[PDB]
Every structure is written in structure tokens, then in C-alpha cells.
Amino acid sequence: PLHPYWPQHLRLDNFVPNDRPTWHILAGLFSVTGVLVVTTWLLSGRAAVVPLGTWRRLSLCWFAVCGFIHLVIEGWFVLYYEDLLGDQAFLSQLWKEYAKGDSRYILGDNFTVCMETITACLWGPLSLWVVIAFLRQHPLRFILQLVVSVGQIYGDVLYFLTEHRDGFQHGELGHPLYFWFYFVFMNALWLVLPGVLVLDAVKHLTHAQSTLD
Amino acid sequence: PLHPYWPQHLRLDNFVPNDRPTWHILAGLFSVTGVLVVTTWLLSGRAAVVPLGTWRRLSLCWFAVCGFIHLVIEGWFVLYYEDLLGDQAFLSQLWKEYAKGDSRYILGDNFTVCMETITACLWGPLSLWVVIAFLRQHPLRFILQLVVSVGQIYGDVLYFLTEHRDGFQHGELGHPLYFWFYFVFMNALWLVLPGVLVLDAVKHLTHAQSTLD
Numbered sequence A, B: 001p002l003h004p005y006w007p008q009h010l011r012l013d014n015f016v017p018n019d020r021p022t023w024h025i026l027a028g029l030f031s032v033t034g035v036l037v038v039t040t041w042l043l044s045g046r047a048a049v050v051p052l053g054t055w056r057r058l059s060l061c062w063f064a065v066c067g068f069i070h071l072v073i074e075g076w077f078v079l080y081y082e083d084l085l086g087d088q089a090f091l092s093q094l095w096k097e098y099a100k101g102d103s104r105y106i107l108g109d110n111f112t113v114c115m116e117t118i119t120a121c122l123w124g125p126l127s128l129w130v131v132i133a134f135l136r137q138h139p140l141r142f143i144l145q146l147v148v149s150v151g152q153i154y155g156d157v158l159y160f161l162t163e164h165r166d167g168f169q170h171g172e173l174g175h176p177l178y179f180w181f182y183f184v185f186m187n188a189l190w191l192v193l194p195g196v197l198v199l200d201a202v203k204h205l206t207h208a209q210s211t212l213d
């Protein structure tokens, strides 16, 4: 058909197909984020006021990845959601590819735009501030971790609930790549990893409160 | 016209007007919540493991009010949003009156239903658990306060942002009772009082973290 997105009765003008093969885009994102992850591992190795341990370093790598994604990938959507169609910039093509599992990013839905606006403006800088805090053993580190994780979980839950109440019409149900991987799995992370970071922070802050009392 | 809600080109069947005068409904809600507030004041007076102080007692009264509202008033909407029109139950009439400043509660918007579902299921019981925690000086008290306040702020911000992006079409702009009071003021509380409770909790938890370190 003219366009690949769901529902198929959509009428999208100014749709022009992605020029690059999709694996260019996907592999570029994975390569750059892997470089970011290894660089953050090294940084936590050499730039910590006191040693951190393996799993906290991995948590900082996660927070750096979240900061990059929210500031750049989602920020590009928030800036240019009106012109994702008919554009051949790298991040625009990435969004066009991703939206085949969720067409709300092409339709400019109000809830989506608002949620990604909040995510790009608040949770990205706060995710990087978490890393800065943990490097210097500042206070607020577990507080910021808890706040960011709670916000991410709330946003993802609202996202899933709204798409469910719409009947899963913005994406083909049961398609391996577009439903299970793009829509479910890549979002289920922001339900699972933040959750572990909420149970963890609560364990430490509580131990602090019992120390005062 | 047939119905009072905005936009006026809406076509609502099964609309049947409120039977009671509106001040019955408003005064009943204010009277019962005032009884709740004074009862919570007394309870914090006589049922605290250690004395709490005036402003913390007021915070507990706020949390009890939030718990009642989220569990009952918003829970009624989540349960019966399909049949608010054409019903003459007390809370149904309350919702019909309130929606004259925001018609999304009559239209059953997906974002509204999902947000109030989360609010009724999570933040109400957690708001009451905050009170129970503060009464017994359990830990988690400031953690729960922070989490509930952050969730309330996030929900209210998304609410306002979505209605703004819609152009303020679900309510008459600049009407004293329906815009400033119902829509803005009654919601601005959940931006102002939670915020003060986020700056407060951060002050205490931080002092705990500095005690461990």
C-alpha cells in the first residue's frame, strides 16, 4: 500500500519512504549507545570519589543511556513531530521505522506529545544528574533515582493502558518485530529496570531513616 | 440548549438534568470532608506513638482527604463513567456538575479514564498508608509522601498539558465558576500542596543520607 502503518484506513500525505536500509539506522543506534555504555563504565571506574561496585556502575550506565535517549531521540520527536513524515534525517527515519509498531507518533497524538515532552525535559537531565550525584557521593542520589524510576513507570503504565483501551489498533497484533519487540519489549524495560531501582532505593533510604530514629 | 457542556456541537443522548439543587451536592461534600478533617485532627492528636506537631497533622489531614477523594469520588467515575449521564446518584450528580468545566469526564476520554484509574487504585491507598506510617513513626513515611506527591504532580501536569494542546475546548474560557474555580483552582492545589511536600520530604531524607555517610 501507500503507507505501512496501522490502521490501514489512515490517509497519510507527505509520506516518503526511508532511504537508508533499516539496519543502518538500527546498527548505528546500537553502536553509539554501546560506545556510550563502555565509556560510562570506564568513567565510573576512574572518576568516582569512592569505589562504586559492579552493579551500581551498571545502574549508572543505564541512567546515562536513559539520559541520552530522552534528551536526543525523544527530544527530536518533541521538536519535529509535525514533520517526521517526508523527512530523511537519521532520527526521523528511526522514528518512522519505530512507529510501524505504534502509529501514534506519526499521528501526533496529544497524550504522546505531552508525555514525551515531560520525559525529554525532566527525566533526561535528572537521569544525568543521578550519575553526577553517584560519582561524587552527593545526597539526593537515591532520591533522584526513585523519582526518575517512578516517573518512568507511571509514563509507561499510562502508555500501555491508553493503547489497550484503544484496542491495540495503532499496531498489528501479534507481529513478532513490531508488536513483541518494538512495542512490548522495548517498553517493558522501563517497567522492569526502574522497578528494581525503586525496590533498591527504598531499601537504602529506609535504612537511613531507621538510623536517624 | 439540550445540554450545558462544551463544545456546544456535542450531541449527548441520555442526558437528564440534575434533580437536586447544586448547593445540596456541594455543601454535602464540603460538610463530610470537613468532618473527616476534624476527625483526622483529633486522631493525630490522640493516636500518635509520639507527638507530631501542627503542620504535620495538617499534612496528614490533607493525605486523608486525598485518600477519601481518590477512593470514593474518583473511584465512582472509574466504575461508572459510561453512565454518568442519565443517573441521579449523589456522586453522579457531583460529576455532572463538575464536568461543566471539563467535559472529558462525560465523553469518557481514554487518558482521563486511565489517569483516574491509576489515581484511585494506587494513590488513595498509598495516601492512607502515609497517614498510618506517620502515626506509628514507621519508616517509608517520607518515601511514601514523596512518591504520592510526585505521582499527583505528574498526573495534574499531564492533565493541564493535554487540555492546553486541545485548545481549552472542553470548557468555556474565562468563566469564573467553571474555568477558574472548577478547572484551574481545584486542580492547582494538586500542583502546590504536593510540591511543598516534595521540597519538605527531600529536606528530611537528605538529612538522613548525610547521617549514614
Ligand SMILES: CN1c2ccc(C(F)(F)F)cc2C(=O)C12CCN(CC1CCOCC1)CC2
Binding pocket: A026, A029, A069, A073, A074, A098, A115, A119, A152, A153, A155, A156, A159, A182, A186, A187, A190
Ligand atoms: C522510540 N524508542 C526506540 C526506538 C527504537 C529502538 C531500537 F529498536 F532501536 F532498539 C529503541 C527505542 C527506545 O528505547 C524508544 C525510546 C524510549 N522509550 C521509553 C519510554 C518513553 C515513555 O515513558 C516510558 C518509557 C521506548 C522506545
Ligand SMILES: CN1c2ccc(C(F)(F)F)cc2C(=O)C12CCN(CC1CCOCC1)CC2
Binding pocket: B026, B029, B069, B073, B074, B098, B115, B119, B152, B153, B155, B156, B159, B182, B186, B187, B190
Ligand atoms: C472532580 N473533583 C472535584 C469535584 C468538585 C469539587 C468541589 F467543587 F466540590 F470542591 C472538588 C473536586 C476535586 O477535588 C476533584 C477530584 C480530585 N481532582 C484531583 C486531580 C486528579 C488527577 O490528578 C491530579 C489531581 C480534582 C477535582
